[PDB]
């Protein structure tokens, strides 16, 4: 079927530049207009740019005009977004969408989204701290502190522990992100069977595991 796949996201400094790609398959690419639409951390969808099937009619949102250029390479079935003079407010998840559903034109198929963060903050792995505490149940935790950019991903016992895990959305303080995660386990079997939070940070290729040790 129709397939749209994106890449090129990442961290860039303000005033910087970057180029996103959107690969298409399962339809005649050169017969459809295509869109870029974005979605900020808070948030909501925002139309960015449109290009007709043959790259003749191009349209831009007011806030990107003269900074962004949208283009396509029809032989290679690929849609592009060239971003320059980047501002903080350009921080968003970027989606490509097909202008299909003829003759009721609509964004019928969307890519997966590729994340762009625009900041002068640099890429930093998190520190990771175990949070130890009758109950029958006991709650344990994992503090993930001072990383950049978003995201981090959290698992407990490498995915084995599912239910009762709450992973809280990150918050920015003093230039970096912090989040925490909690898990609930049986009180009669802790600590005699081990609990580990695993944290990975895509942007810096960092992975950390942390056993939760008891303390009175």
């Amino acid at each position: 079927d129709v397939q749209l796949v994106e890449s090129g996201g990442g961290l860039v400094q303000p005033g910087g530049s970057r180029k996103l790609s959107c690969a298409a398959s399962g339809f005649t690419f050169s017969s459809f207009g295509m869109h870029w639409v974005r979605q900020a951390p808070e948030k909501g969808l925002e139309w960015v740019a449109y290009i007709s099937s043959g790259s003749s009619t191009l349209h831009y949102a007011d806030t990107v005009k003269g900074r962004f250029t949208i283009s396509r390479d029809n032989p290679k079935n690929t849609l592009f977004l060239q971003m320059t003079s980047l501002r903080s407010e350009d921080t968003a998840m970027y989606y490509c969408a097909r202008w299909g559903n003829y003759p009721h034109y609509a964004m019928d198929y969307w890519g997966q989204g590729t994340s762009v963060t625009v900041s002068s903050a640099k890429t930093t792995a998190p520190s990771v701290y175990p949070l130890a505490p009758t109950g029958s149940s006991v709650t344990l935790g994992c503090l993930v502190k001072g990383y950049f950019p978003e995201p981090v991903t959290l698992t407990w016992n490498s995915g084995s522990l599912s239910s009762g895990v709450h992973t809280f959305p990150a918050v920015l303080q003093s230039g970096l992100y912090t989040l925490s995660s909690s898990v609930t386990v049986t009180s009669s079997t802790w600590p005699s069977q081990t609990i580990t939070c695993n944290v990975a940070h895509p942007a810096s290729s960092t992975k950390v595991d942390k056993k939760i040790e008891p303390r009175v």
Partner: protein
């Protein structure tokens, strides 16, 4: 520009009931309003085109309506899997524009938060840091207010609050509250307390420990 005002941004509805989402345009549209559903991890998916046509695989429980200036999405009856962000959108003139979105949530029975408090780990302390953490888990409704006290005194400097979205399992919310201190200050006080105000309690729900 065709401005789309979507309301409410947040809406809770009991299973079996009727959800209504409104989208008012600043000027008149077709037949050119569409609706998109966006589930937590995923990209938006087209739900309604035109103003009332269902797209492939969209349940009949979803119906869109309206004309001119005023459009609606109604889901009757709401089911557990309808939890999502819903966005209206005009396809009638550039610039194409979207509403601000609506977060649809399941209404359920009130639940008091289960609270756990955690002293800074020895590993953070040894690095000079001192974050104290409070988990407020599995509560409903979502509005809750957390205050931190140090030796009985309120402290709002260095407090990070974070809410999950509605949990698929039990439709409850959870939130995390972190008081960020330096070790030098942490070592100079004795007792730490997070207090929360929530619908399910007339008095503040309190959790405390003494540093040792």
């Amino acid at each position: 520009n065709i401005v789309m005002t979507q309301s409410p941004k947040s809406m809770s509805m009991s299973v079996g009931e009727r959800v209504t989402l409104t989208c008012k345009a600043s000027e008149n549209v077709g037949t050119y309003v569409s609706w998109y559903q966006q589930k937590p991890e995923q990209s938006p998916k087209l739900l309604i085109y035109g103003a009332s046509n269902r797209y492939t695989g969209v349940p009949d429980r979803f119906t869109g309506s309206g004309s001119a200036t005023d459009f609606t999405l109604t889901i009757s009856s709401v089911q557990a899997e309808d939890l999502a962000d819903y966005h209206c959108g005009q396809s009638y003139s550039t610039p194409y524009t979207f509403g601000g979105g609506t977060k649809l949530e399941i209404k359920r029975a009130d639940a008091a938060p289960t609270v756990s408090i955690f002293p800074p780990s020895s590993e953070q302390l040894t690095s000079g840091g001192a974050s104290v953490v409070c988990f407020l888990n599995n509560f409903y409704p979502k509005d809750i207010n957390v205050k931190w006290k140090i030796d009985g005194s309120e402290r709002q400097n260095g407090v990070l609050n974070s809410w999950t979205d509605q949990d698929s399992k039990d439709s409850t919310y959870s939130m995390s509250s972190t008081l960020t201190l330096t070790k030098d200050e942490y070592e100079r006080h004795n007792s730490y307390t997070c207090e929360a105000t929530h619908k399910t309690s007339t008095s503040p729900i309190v959790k405390s420990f003494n540093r040792n």
